[PDB]
Amino acid sequence: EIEVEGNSQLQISFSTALASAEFRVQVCSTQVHCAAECHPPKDHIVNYP
Amino acid sequence: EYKTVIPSPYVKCCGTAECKDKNLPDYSCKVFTGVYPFMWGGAYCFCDA
Amino acid sequence: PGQFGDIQSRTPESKDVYANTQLVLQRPAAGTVHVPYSQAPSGFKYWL
Amino acid sequence: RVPKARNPTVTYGKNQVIMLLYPDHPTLLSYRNMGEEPNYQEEWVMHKKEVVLTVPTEGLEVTWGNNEPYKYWPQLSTNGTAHGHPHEIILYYYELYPTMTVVVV
Amino acid sequence: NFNVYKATRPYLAHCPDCGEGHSCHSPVALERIRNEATDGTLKIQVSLQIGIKTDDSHDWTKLRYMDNHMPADAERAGLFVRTSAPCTITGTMGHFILARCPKGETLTVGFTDSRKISHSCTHPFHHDPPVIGREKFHSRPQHGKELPCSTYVQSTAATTEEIEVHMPPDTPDRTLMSQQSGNVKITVNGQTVRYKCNCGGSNEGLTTTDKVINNCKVDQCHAAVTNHKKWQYNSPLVPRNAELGDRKGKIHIPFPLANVTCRVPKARNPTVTYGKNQVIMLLYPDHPTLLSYRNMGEEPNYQEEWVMHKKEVVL
Amino acid sequence: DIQLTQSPSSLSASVGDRVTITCRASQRISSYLNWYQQKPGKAPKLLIYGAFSLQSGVPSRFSGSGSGTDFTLTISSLQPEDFATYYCQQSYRTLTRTFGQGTKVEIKRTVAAPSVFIFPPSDEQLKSGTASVVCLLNNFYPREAKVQWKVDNALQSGNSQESVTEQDSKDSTYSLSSTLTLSKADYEKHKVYACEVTHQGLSSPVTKSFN
Amino acid sequence: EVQLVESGGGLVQPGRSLRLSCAASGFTFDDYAMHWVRQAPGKGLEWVSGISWNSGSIGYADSVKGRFTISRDNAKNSLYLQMNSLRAEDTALYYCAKDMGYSGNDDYYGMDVWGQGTTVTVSSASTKGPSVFPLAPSSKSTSGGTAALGCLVKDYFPEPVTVSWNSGALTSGVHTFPAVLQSSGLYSLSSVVTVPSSSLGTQTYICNVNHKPSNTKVDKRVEP
């Protein structure tokens, strides 16, 4: 969830397996289409799923 | 062959010990809490917190 | 660490010493006053 | 009371974990896959040794001596890249999904 | 000389195994084992002070050790070192013992007390000296070749390497306090005692004489000896009383490393016969011996192997 | 705010005597107390720290001690060079270090009466619109002298100043200066001036005077 | 070789600021915390302020808490104290001292190295020169008690007044007193010498008053 007031912008974080991110974000019944190119990680191995 | 040097540990029974960095070839320092050290004649530190 | 050249100096008498031993301090336990640590063994001894 | 083996030196490669073990005394090294087929393997190490382990998609769990277990998972890393030239794109997908890539192409 | 030890004292330190399979604080705890020498000689650093009496006189037949709150004397003849088998001591001084020990995975040191009570401390230690030359031998031969090696010498001064000695931390002792009909005794016994506790009597401070608190219970209060005249090595097993140690002094370390020559055996001649472009030899080793050969040309094809028994080799 | 308490003034001792100086806090401050030594015209020097450790370069004559909450500084045998003002200090484990008032050590001597001289105001002073009557006490040993001014056989106060010298290096005596300040207009209203001196070295109070 | 050197000080008016500093030498500046201590005439040592290593913690005495600021320049191995809104109560000798560690939270230490304190005087007064008056001996009544004669130096502002007799020729039987601050803000001191009464009519005695700050020298003759 996020907080909204007046005229402003919100920042959220996301995780995807997509090389190209194409998705819609649903806030309070006002959906927005968002997309961007994603880059690969430099590291090969991590200790988390 | 390298030699590892470990000076006597400093114990502060009723407060937090602080750390200063050094310019020695390979140096590390850390403060541990919740310690309750004992000697041959019984507990060394009076404060249990 | 763990390899030849883990500790280096330009000359035997030099005070300018490089070292990489991955020395990590560990927490004491059981009421003791010892200072436990984890460190790679000298690469010089392994090489010999 | 039992001893705990020294923390190993660890480096990483593509779907690969490389460890350098520095025992004072013989210790047991073992690991399992965290997927359906654990493929359990174990060995005793009596000296400094370089050990190379392969990491599956499901993740790998490694336990050395009396130390707590380590867990590893792969990331979708490439030497190629998405977008750009067609040959850069094929390399990108080949490195991540080589089986499928050869089938689709 | 031993003049540097006039202001020093013996100290107690924790030992992981006191010989019973259990840990305790011990007067014979080891600080470090040094094996820089290649001739197999070990240099052991211990809390015991050898060759020095409690009266600060010099006597090579006596050692001094810590006993509760006082120094005490014991015979040097009772000092021993052991690994997998009894070890030979080559010399001693202060906190350092030189000895030549047989191969093993553990090392221990100890001595007999003034009450004829044995004290020992055991630590893990891998003792397995490097091979000098191309043959593995267990003892020096009557005749053989001479190769360079490193040893420790008997020099006792001007080694330039020094150990810092500092004033010791407060020493706790539950035996100082006892409960006599609703009051606590304190019992200083000649050594200044600091006491304090979370008691309603709010009775805390220093004393040089027996001080009866008169309100609290012995199980409620703590006490320790704070007034010390002699300094000790700032061992990693002894807590620091200040961010930086005080009453700093220095003790030099005896027995420096030196360049010497070691004697090694020579394997007996093989029996040799010849074929066509072929050399056949019978090896007769008494102990593991390295065999190696190369072609005297562009491609040496170097090969080597160890032989631990009679073997027929065809080259 | 915790204050330290020490001996109220000074100690009197000869060479070879045992000297004991104590310091206590009204409330617990720390586990340790430091001692400092200061001589006139010089910066203070650390003598003992940690309540037990002697500072390097300091003679073995000095040692730490204590009882209960009372910290003690002991000089086993007082030397001519050990005559100084000593101070106690505690840190309270913070930067705001707290110092005591200090205890002075005086040279022991026998008791002797002051020699009293009275100096009437000069003509130059009277011409300046002022007057000053000076009473000087020379070569006396006890420092606690009592001096009062009298004008026309009556006591006056609040119009005078006093100054005392340091102990003499050879005779081990003190000198005291008492000055009575008057305006020209008031000085001339009186005919008799006197200095009354009471001292432990006197069999009776001595008064000196002039018209 | 280890020492602290004080710099700055002098006469300042009330309400004005004054900057003090100290140079470190013979030791590593970055290994120790530094403190300021002041001592007024007739008083013991009073702690003023202190600074921990790397300015990890700053402390001030309550009396100067809102007026004094402490800082250190490690690159220059120097210590600074900024005193604002100075009051008459702040008149004292100001010393720098070195601690025995990097933190002030260690109560096992004292101050082992002290410098040579400077003088700071706070007063709304000019450097007025002294007036000198003779103190004639009462030879009419003290002739059998040995004669005492002297001089008075009065109404001068600056502290460092030097008084001697017969241009230093007379050193024996000479008593001098510390100057006393008057309510006027000015200082005064007396000087007396003890001589045989029979010499009063044969030997002339001169009171020599030397006031450096005013380039003034006064030679006063004292007679019965």
PDB file of C-alpha atoms in Angstrom, chain E residues 17-119:
ATOM      1  CA  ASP E  17      41.963 -29.265  28.787  1.00  0.00           C
ATOM      2  CA  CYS E  18      43.479 -29.608  32.267  1.00  0.00           C
ATOM      3  CA  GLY E  19      44.146 -33.318  31.690  1.00  0.00           C
ATOM      4  CA  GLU E  20      40.786 -34.576  32.944  1.00  0.00           C
ATOM      5  CA  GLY E  21      39.012 -33.878  29.651  1.00  0.00           C
ATOM      6  CA  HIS E  22      37.556 -30.774  31.296  1.00  0.00           C
ATOM      7  CA  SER E  23      38.587 -27.131  31.059  1.00  0.00           C
ATOM      8  CA  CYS E  24      39.760 -24.958  33.971  1.00  0.00           C
ATOM      9  CA  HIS E  25      41.989 -22.036  34.883  1.00  0.00           C
ATOM     10  CA  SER E  26      45.555 -23.317  35.103  1.00  0.00           C
ATOM     11  CA  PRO E  27      49.067 -22.093  36.120  1.00  0.00           C
ATOM     12  CA  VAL E  28      50.576 -24.018  33.221  1.00  0.00           C
ATOM     13  CA  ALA E  29      48.364 -22.728  30.421  1.00  0.00           C
ATOM     14  CA  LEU E  30      50.146 -22.343  27.075  1.00  0.00           C
ATOM     15  CA  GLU E  31      50.179 -19.065  25.167  1.00  0.00           C
ATOM     16  CA  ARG E  32      51.719 -20.027  21.833  1.00  0.00           C
ATOM     17  CA  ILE E  33      53.696 -22.680  19.982  1.00  0.00           C
ATOM     18  CA  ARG E  34      56.303 -21.506  17.479  1.00  0.00           C
ATOM     19  CA  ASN E  35      57.820 -23.765  14.819  1.00  0.00           C
ATOM     20  CA  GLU E  36      59.757 -21.455  12.486  1.00  0.00           C
ATOM     21  CA  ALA E  37      62.845 -23.677  12.616  1.00  0.00           C
ATOM     22  CA  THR E  38      63.128 -26.371   9.956  1.00  0.00           C
ATOM     23  CA  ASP E  39      65.237 -28.752  12.036  1.00  0.00           C
ATOM     24  CA  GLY E  40      62.088 -29.723  13.946  1.00  0.00           C
ATOM     25  CA  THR E  41      62.869 -27.804  17.143  1.00  0.00           C
ATOM     26  CA  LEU E  42      59.834 -26.346  18.907  1.00  0.00           C
ATOM     27  CA  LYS E  43      59.707 -23.100  20.863  1.00  0.00           C
ATOM     28  CA  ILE E  44      56.920 -23.025  23.445  1.00  0.00           C
ATOM     29  CA  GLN E  45      55.643 -19.969  25.319  1.00  0.00           C
ATOM     30  CA  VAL E  46      54.075 -20.654  28.731  1.00  0.00           C
ATOM     31  CA  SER E  47      52.788 -18.705  31.744  1.00  0.00           C
ATOM     32  CA  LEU E  48      55.460 -20.336  33.939  1.00  0.00           C
ATOM     33  CA  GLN E  49      58.649 -18.433  34.721  1.00  0.00           C
ATOM     34  CA  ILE E  50      61.681 -20.725  34.677  1.00  0.00           C
ATOM     35  CA  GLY E  51      65.024 -19.994  36.354  1.00  0.00           C
ATOM     36  CA  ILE E  52      63.484 -17.288  38.510  1.00  0.00           C
ATOM     37  CA  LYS E  53      62.570 -17.632  42.186  1.00  0.00           C
ATOM     38  CA  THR E  54      59.820 -15.823  44.100  1.00  0.00           C
ATOM     39  CA  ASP E  55      62.543 -13.795  45.821  1.00  0.00           C
ATOM     40  CA  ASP E  56      63.660 -12.541  42.386  1.00  0.00           C
ATOM     41  CA  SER E  57      66.989 -14.355  42.680  1.00  0.00           C
ATOM     42  CA  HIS E  58      68.518 -16.362  39.829  1.00  0.00           C
ATOM     43  CA  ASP E  59      68.375 -20.142  40.210  1.00  0.00           C
ATOM     44  CA  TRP E  60      68.383 -22.396  37.157  1.00  0.00           C
ATOM     45  CA  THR E  61      67.151 -25.352  39.218  1.00  0.00           C
ATOM     46  CA  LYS E  62      63.903 -23.631  40.224  1.00  0.00           C
ATOM     47  CA  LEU E  63      60.765 -22.320  38.535  1.00  0.00           C
ATOM     48  CA  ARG E  64      58.147 -19.953  39.894  1.00  0.00           C
ATOM     49  CA  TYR E  65      54.422 -20.143  39.257  1.00  0.00           C
ATOM     50  CA  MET E  66      51.214 -18.464  40.330  1.00  0.00           C
ATOM     51  CA  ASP E  67      49.282 -19.921  43.262  1.00  0.00           C
ATOM     52  CA  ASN E  68      46.032 -18.102  44.016  1.00  0.00           C
ATOM     53  CA  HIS E  69      47.164 -14.616  45.069  1.00  0.00           C
ATOM     54  CA  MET E  70      50.839 -15.432  45.639  1.00  0.00           C
ATOM     55  CA  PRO E  71      53.912 -16.575  43.645  1.00  0.00           C
ATOM     56  CA  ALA E  72      55.332 -19.962  44.658  1.00  0.00           C
ATOM     57  CA  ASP E  73      58.470 -22.019  43.962  1.00  0.00           C
ATOM     58  CA  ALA E  74      58.824 -25.493  42.426  1.00  0.00           C
ATOM     59  CA  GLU E  75      61.679 -27.690  41.189  1.00  0.00           C
ATOM     60  CA  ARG E  76      62.742 -27.247  37.560  1.00  0.00           C
ATOM     61  CA  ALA E  77      63.436 -30.976  37.485  1.00  0.00           C
ATOM     62  CA  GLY E  78      59.684 -31.594  37.580  1.00  0.00           C
ATOM     63  CA  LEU E  79      59.094 -29.743  34.302  1.00  0.00           C
ATOM     64  CA  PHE E  80      58.053 -31.864  31.331  1.00  0.00           C
ATOM     65  CA  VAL E  81      56.893 -31.602  27.723  1.00  0.00           C
ATOM     66  CA  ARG E  82      55.006 -34.310  25.833  1.00  0.00           C
ATOM     67  CA  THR E  83      53.359 -34.941  22.463  1.00  0.00           C
ATOM     68  CA  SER E  84      52.760 -38.478  21.218  1.00  0.00           C
ATOM     69  CA  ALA E  85      55.687 -39.476  23.409  1.00  0.00           C
ATOM     70  CA  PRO E  86      57.979 -37.846  26.046  1.00  0.00           C
ATOM     71  CA  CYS E  87      59.773 -34.784  24.639  1.00  0.00           C
ATOM     72  CA  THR E  88      63.357 -33.702  25.285  1.00  0.00           C
ATOM     73  CA  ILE E  89      63.932 -30.198  26.633  1.00  0.00           C
ATOM     74  CA  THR E  90      67.042 -28.518  25.238  1.00  0.00           C
ATOM     75  CA  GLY E  91      66.891 -25.406  27.413  1.00  0.00           C
ATOM     76  CA  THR E  92      64.646 -22.929  29.216  1.00  0.00           C
ATOM     77  CA  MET E  93      64.381 -19.274  30.194  1.00  0.00           C
ATOM     78  CA  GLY E  94      61.545 -17.231  31.633  1.00  0.00           C
ATOM     79  CA  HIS E  95      58.393 -17.987  29.660  1.00  0.00           C
ATOM     80  CA  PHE E  96      60.133 -19.911  26.893  1.00  0.00           C
ATOM     81  CA  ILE E  97      60.958 -23.603  26.547  1.00  0.00           C
ATOM     82  CA  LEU E  98      63.051 -25.146  23.772  1.00  0.00           C
ATOM     83  CA  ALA E  99      62.416 -28.810  23.066  1.00  0.00           C
ATOM     84  CA  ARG E 100      62.733 -31.525  20.415  1.00  0.00           C
ATOM     85  CA  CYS E 101      59.466 -33.493  20.259  1.00  0.00           C
ATOM     86  CA  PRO E 102      58.364 -36.625  18.324  1.00  0.00           C
ATOM     87  CA  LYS E 103      55.578 -36.370  15.742  1.00  0.00           C
ATOM     88  CA  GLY E 104      52.007 -36.067  17.009  1.00  0.00           C
ATOM     89  CA  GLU E 105      48.713 -34.163  16.841  1.00  0.00           C
ATOM     90  CA  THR E 106      48.718 -32.770  20.386  1.00  0.00           C
ATOM     91  CA  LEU E 107      51.170 -31.037  22.713  1.00  0.00           C
ATOM     92  CA  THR E 108      51.145 -30.683  26.492  1.00  0.00           C
ATOM     93  CA  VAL E 109      53.261 -29.095  29.225  1.00  0.00           C
ATOM     94  CA  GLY E 110      53.244 -29.440  33.014  1.00  0.00           C
ATOM     95  CA  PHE E 111      55.133 -29.567  36.320  1.00  0.00           C
ATOM     96  CA  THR E 112      54.901 -30.862  39.902  1.00  0.00           C
ATOM     97  CA  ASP E 113      53.543 -28.427  42.511  1.00  0.00           C
ATOM     98  CA  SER E 114      54.873 -27.682  46.013  1.00  0.00           C
ATOM     99  CA  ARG E 115      52.140 -29.941  47.359  1.00  0.00           C
ATOM    100  CA  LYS E 116      53.246 -32.723  45.016  1.00  0.00           C
ATOM    101  CA  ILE E 117      50.207 -32.130  42.823  1.00  0.00           C
ATOM    102  CA  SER E 118      50.612 -32.542  39.078  1.00  0.00           C
ATOM    103  CA  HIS E 119      49.521 -29.707  36.796  1.00  0.00           C
TER     104      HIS E 119
END
